[PDB]
């Protein structure tokens, strides 16, 4: 958050924010130092509380993160060794036909 | 009605072949894979690229020009 | 001309067509036995002290 520049008009209920498409939003600053108390024994700085909040929020928006990246790993190891088999059985079959000579005698 | 009995007519020709169990299936793969690509890419690297090459220019021109007249409007917004 | 493993294997269990189909069955029993551990150990070692099982020891059985 930053104070508003010079020569810019603003609404009475509006507060300056540079991250907004309108460059101003009704968000009265709700987050700053030592508004809370972390029960775990942590010196509560604004940055740390904001970081914990963001890490909470994304998880709430999509909880399947942790159960995804594990099947996405037990898929590669299993596949990555069966598929090099099929190739070999292939080669056998197509290896009948790459060995023929073809002469002509009228 | 066009199975393996009745098709074209040919005469006086001959062909030979082995089995698969009396041969190995990797005759110098490493030392013959590369030269084929070396000889063939040259021929058609020239036949797929130049048509595609004139899109990079127009895309970059338009992108950078629009970026100018969006991020640097206050240059010609004269007071 | 010493024979390889392949000749004795084909003499043992491959030229029956009543044996061959079976030992395919066999690998999955072995694979099932040896694969959960092989993947779980590596995944858990990649990121340690970061999932609840590494933090539950604060609050478990009082």
């Amino acid at each position: 958050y930053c104070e508003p520049p010079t020569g810019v008009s603003l609404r009475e209920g509006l507060y300056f924010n540079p991250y907004f498409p309108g460059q101003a939003i009704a968000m009265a600053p709700p987050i700053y130092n030592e508004v809370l108390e972390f029960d775990d024994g942590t010196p509560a700085t604004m940055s740390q509380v904001a970081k914990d909040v963001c890490t909470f929020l994304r998880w709430a928006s999509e909880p399947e993160h942790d159960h995804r990246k594990r099947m996405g790993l037990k898929m590669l190891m299993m596949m990555g060794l069966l598929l090099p088999l099929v190739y070999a059985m292939k080669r056998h079959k197509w290896s009948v036909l790459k060995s023929r000579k073809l002469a002509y005698r009228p | 009605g066009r199975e393996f009995g009745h098709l074209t007519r040919m005469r006086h020709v001959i062909t030979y072949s082995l089995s698969p169990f009396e041969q190995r299936a990797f005759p110098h793969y490493f030392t013959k894979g590369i030269p084929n690509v070396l000889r063939r890419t040259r021929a058609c690297i020239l036949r797929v690229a130049p048509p595609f090459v004139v899109f990079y220019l127009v895309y970059t021109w338009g992108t950078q020009e629009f970026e100018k007249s969006k991020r640097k409007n206050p240059a010609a917004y004269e007071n | 001309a010493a024979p390889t493993l392949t000749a004795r294997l084909y003499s043992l269990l491959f030229r029956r067509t009543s044996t061959f189909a079976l030992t395919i069955a066999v690998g999955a029993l072995f694979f099932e036995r040896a694969f959960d551990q092989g993947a779980d150990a590596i995944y858990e070692h990649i990121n340690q002290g970061k999932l609840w099982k590494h933090i539950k020891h604060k609050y478990e059985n009082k």
Binding site: T55, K69 | - | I46, K50, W52
Partner: peptide, 24 residues
Amino acid sequence: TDLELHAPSYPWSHRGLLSSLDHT
């Protein structure tokens, strides 16, 4: 007809391909 401020990037602790979530 104005500008916008695109946020930077940070080395987030869960940003990898094979990473996890800090559950504390």
